[PDB]
Structure 1
Amino acid sequence: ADLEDNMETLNDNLKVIEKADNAAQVKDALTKMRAAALDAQKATPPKLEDKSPDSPEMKDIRHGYDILVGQIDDALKLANEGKVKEAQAAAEQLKTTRNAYHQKYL
């Protein structure tokens, strides 16, 4: 899957976690967002096509995703304990990384 597909998989699943009632739904959604994130990371965004492999940017965007996966595990750890609400909440913090990094790379 490509970046356009990765982001799409992310957006959709964060939606699902909103409409989610039971724990499981929330888990399968994150499992998916964690896969997508890592993949997205292995990619090179159109605004960085020229940027060098180790450009400070390439390191920034890189780290960004590590923060996203980090926050996904946070909510994943919770969905696992069966704690919906808490995960759903912890899942919102993700919009903050989205905005912070989109602002810089979208």
Structure 2
Amino acid sequence: ADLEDNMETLNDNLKVIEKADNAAQVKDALTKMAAAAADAWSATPPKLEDKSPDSPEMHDFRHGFWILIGQIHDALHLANEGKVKDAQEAAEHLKCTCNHCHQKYR
């Protein structure tokens, strides 16, 4: 899918984790996020179209998605060990990877 599509899958799903009553609402949401950042890894932002697919500025942009995946990964372990509030908090710490990518490439 489209990048904006991915980003709007991430954002609308983080709200969901935040106002969640259910573990399986967090767990579900984080999986869609994981799959959206997986898709978004192989994707070129407006601000780096002119930069090479081997650009360091493109490596770093993709590794922002690599970090987000791992952060989401450890969040999914916590939801699966029953720690629903811990998970939501892991989920809230996503936003700093989110903003790191935005400030530097949006």
Corresponding residue of 1:72: 72
Amino-acid identity (%): 82
- Give the RMSD, CA atoms, in angstroms: 0.6
Please show how residues 20-59 of structure 1 align to structure 2 within 5 Å.
20-59=20-59
Moved segments of 4+, more than 6 Å:
none
Corresponding residue of 1:97: 97
- Structure 2, unaligned stretches of length 5 or more? none
Deviation string 1:53-97 (CA, Å, 9 cap, x unpaired) is: 110111101111110001001111101112110000011110001
The count of residues paired between Structure 1 and Structure 2 equals 106
Deviation string 1:39-61 (CA, Å, 9 cap, x unpaired) is: 11110001010100110111101
Tell me the TM-score normalized by structure 1.
0.97
- Matches of 1:3 and 1:22 in 2, distance apart? 28
